[PDB]
Design an enzyme around this catalytic site. Sequence first.
Site, PDB file in Angstrom:
ATOM      1  N   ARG B  45       0.822  -1.211   0.000  1.00  0.00           N
ATOM      2  CA  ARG B  45       0.000   0.000   0.000  1.00  0.00           C
ATOM      3  C   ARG B  45       0.858   1.264   0.000  1.00  0.00           C
ATOM      4  O   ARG B  45       1.801   1.374   0.760  1.00  0.00           O
ATOM      5  CB  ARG B  45      -0.891  -0.038   1.223  1.00  0.00           C
ATOM      6  CG  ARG B  45      -1.446   1.294   1.613  1.00  0.00           C
ATOM      7  CD  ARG B  45      -2.122   1.200   2.953  1.00  0.00           C
ATOM      8  NE  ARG B  45      -2.330   2.533   3.559  1.00  0.00           N
ATOM      9  CZ  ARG B  45      -1.433   3.521   3.603  1.00  0.00           C
ATOM     10  NH1 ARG B  45      -0.243   3.350   3.076  1.00  0.00           N
ATOM     11  NH2 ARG B  45      -1.726   4.685   4.188  1.00  0.00           N
ATOM     12  N   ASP B 154      11.335  10.406  -6.489  1.00  0.00           N
ATOM     13  CA  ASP B 154      11.061   9.533  -5.342  1.00  0.00           C
ATOM     14  C   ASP B 154      11.965   8.313  -5.251  1.00  0.00           C
ATOM     15  O   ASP B 154      11.498   7.186  -5.066  1.00  0.00           O
ATOM     16  CB  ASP B 154       9.598   9.124  -5.281  1.00  0.00           C
ATOM     17  CG  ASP B 154       9.168   8.718  -3.860  1.00  0.00           C
ATOM     18  OD1 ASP B 154       9.937   9.061  -2.877  1.00  0.00           O
ATOM     19  OD2 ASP B 154       8.074   8.078  -3.774  1.00  0.00           O
TER      20      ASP B 154
END
Lengths: 334, 328, 200, 201
Positions: B45, B154
């Site tokens: 997640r 990222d």
Amino acid sequence: SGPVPSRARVYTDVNTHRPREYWDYESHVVEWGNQDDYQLVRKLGRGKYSEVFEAINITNNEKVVVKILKPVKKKKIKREIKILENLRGGPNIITLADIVKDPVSRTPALVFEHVNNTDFKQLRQTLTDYDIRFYMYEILKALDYCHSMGIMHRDVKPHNVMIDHEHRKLRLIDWGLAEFYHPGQEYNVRVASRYFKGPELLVDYQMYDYSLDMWSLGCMLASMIFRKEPFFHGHDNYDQLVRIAKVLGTEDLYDYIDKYNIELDPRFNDILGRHSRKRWERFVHSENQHLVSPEALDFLDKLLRYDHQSRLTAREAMEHPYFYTVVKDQARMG
Amino acid sequence: GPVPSRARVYTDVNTHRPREYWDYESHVVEWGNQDDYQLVRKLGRGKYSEVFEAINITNNEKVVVKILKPVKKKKIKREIKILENLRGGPNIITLADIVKDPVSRTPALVFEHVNNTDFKQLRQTLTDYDIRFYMYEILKALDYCHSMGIMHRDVKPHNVMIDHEHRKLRLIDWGLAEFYHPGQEYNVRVASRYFKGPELLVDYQMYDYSLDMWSLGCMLASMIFRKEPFFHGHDNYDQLVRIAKVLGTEDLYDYIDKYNIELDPRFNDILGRHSRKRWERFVHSENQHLVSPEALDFLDKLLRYDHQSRLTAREAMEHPYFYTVVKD
Amino acid sequence: SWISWFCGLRGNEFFCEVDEDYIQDKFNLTGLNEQVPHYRQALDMILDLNPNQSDLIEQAAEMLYGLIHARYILTNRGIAQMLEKYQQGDFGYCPRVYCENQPMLPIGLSDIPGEAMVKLYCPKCMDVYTPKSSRHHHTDGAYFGTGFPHMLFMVHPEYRPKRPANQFVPRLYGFKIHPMAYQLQLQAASNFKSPVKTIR
Amino acid sequence: VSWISWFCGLRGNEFFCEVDEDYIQDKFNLTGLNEQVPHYRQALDMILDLEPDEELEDNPNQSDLIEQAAEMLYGLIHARYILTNRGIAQMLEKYQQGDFGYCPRVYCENQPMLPIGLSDIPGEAMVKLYCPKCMDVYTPKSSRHHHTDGAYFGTGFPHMLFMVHPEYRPKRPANQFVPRLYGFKIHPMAYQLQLQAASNF
Ligand SMILES: [Zn+2]
Ligand SMILES: [Zn+2]
């Protein structure tokens, strides 16, 4: 003086020579099968003592007919079971395939072989001159067998004869009124079905025998060859004899009750009258003539006789000219 | 005002491309057949995504489905255009299919199944040669996307997927990625706390590809020193403090000076005065076999406050720390 | 009359009024003397014919009627009377969604008293359900039998409802759950709930 | 006390869990819901116990349209919330309490159930119940839960839950209903037959 005694012309003493366990049905210990072997499919019909389903044997995928009993008349159920196990494997007798009970309720059920009963029950279809001869010969096979085994059916009628027309296979069913023959014995006269009752039952002669079936048969034959269903159509038991007397005549009837010192119910005197013995030709019309032949009428006439002793036996009937063509084919097919 | 900065490599790559390449808002998405895939188990997640191991019922092959939660339509079209642009470049994750829910309308991305090695597993297993090999592999991906004019924005351990059995690597999650146009001011709420570069914490918006290199430095430090994460800030402001305690305050003040960066008054009270520590403090019996003179030298050249003075991906690949690797 | 009052009581909605016609013919009541105590005095209370005994006799009459009911509702008349209640949904409606509130039939899981309470059979899904109203949670299952509904549809095959039009399709963000994924799930639950070490 | 505690405490609203405020304040969690409810701002403000907007506009009795918008919005937030780990943990708690009612199938042996929507679009279907054991979907027994929108619980809530907590999967049922008539089982050839006689009819 008391009625004149009577004995069967064939297989008279077969039951007396037998060991006790053969005819002593009230000593029969039932051998229970396994109810998990069978599973219900559809309801076939209902009775006062029974629930009847078409089932299926899951062990071999063969169709069966389950008959669930509510255990009344301890005798009459045991009588039937003994009879069917005695008559097992006989020509055209229905196989009692198994007997079982519910683990909890204990309500028993009889398991019979299924017969794909094919009623010409409105294809508006029908049989033939030969079909009648063939099937009549098949019925006699079972009757001559059951009589030889010392058992009288006592309920021979179209309903109790199952025909799988396509496979040409015939079975005689419902031995709930079948009984052992013991010479001298006085039997219940409330058997049969009105239209198929023999005169012995109608005038209350109780020492009857296998020949009772023979009258019942003769009734079925007249029904088939004349195309009248049923042939003798009485509105009650009293009128039943009247319907016979208008065909067979009153003279042979009065001779019959004389011979056996039977006493008529006074009631018959008023309603019976006096009738001539009619020629079978009176019932022939454009629609049944192709089924009526001199052989059929001759054979018919030697079945339907007031005197039960003067009827043909099952074996004698099989040897009549009416069956020659059928016997020949039976022979040729090995 | 704050002093303008350019990228020292691949500066104008997007501006002389056809607009089809960089105008992601304009991009029309090829939709697939959703009924092809059924969900087996939950895998992970994110903040924008739910990840499932799936199976493609048409061919029985194992797949991965990244379900994207409600975001702007911009961000999704951007991730997709970027993934299509970078399709089949070295160690870039291959986009296998895009699907959509008809009723929910919530979009999902499908991938070839990665046999990624557990993250903790390979922190126990990686050798001195292994880190060098995989660092090189990440650099091939970073240099490719920078050549193609995209910064990842990222870079972190979880966005690098290692199939350590088959010794092959894949840089994932381009949801924060962006196209580089010279002189444009970008959002600084990118990255992840422990991997944000100083230009993000001091609010310097005119950053470039070099942001990734800092992120990569934090990754290296974490691996060679076996301390995860290396710069462990409690929040965005403490993050700069943790870095200031290693790289010193001196170089940092020289940096905000160089570019006329305005500090949030918040820092003053908690930043203070710190020496530039030698990397030898972080070396102990348990991590030493991974630390070398070449590793320290390489790490130092990455972790620079001044974004303009960090080693570009191409330069990094030339450093002596890789010499043992490149021959193969 | 006792029959009309009992069937009109709170909780006994599932019962139909047994014809006295049927109860007066003692053919039908066979074996029931060896099933309930105080059989003669319990049968008297049903056809309307000391605080120690008069209390117990009322309970034995309740157990008699119920057993008779189990037989009665298998008969063509008893079937027709229940079938009337079934057409007005006196037996509740199916809680399954894709049965679309199919009317139900009472059924017993067991035929011997005291073993199980009454349950509801759905002609569509063909499974059994616990009555939704907690006023029926005290009706002995033995009073309706294991065979009642099965007998019903044998006598009236016309009344079988067609198999469910639709089916439940689990969807997560519109992706269906592959069955590979329950086989997994079912372990993790086994492998999970495992004997925690019992310190010496 | 709060609007959420009020809403989650009303009769018929037993299936709902009280959503954390911090989840609601964070705009990222509510992306795209502004185009699903009317009077979005005033609705959200109502949920968060903040002072309402003005007077002299309740020409459509505008209080009522905002009150209903706030109701619809809370459900739609609830739908996303219970898919999150925290939302799962709150509902799992209610599940262990049996707050969602129990399975009506006899051979499920009163397995606790979870709420679920047949549809995600509001106004299409009311809330239903999913039994993890028999894996089928049922109507709640009380008519108090017959007026709660299924879109508020979501299409894949229980599916998520077991994928996140597979430990909670009950073993599929040990026994199955076996129809018996006078001891005899019923063949299956006999429904196929029964089903025509109703068609043919
Ligand atoms: Zn149902
Ligand atoms: Zn269930």
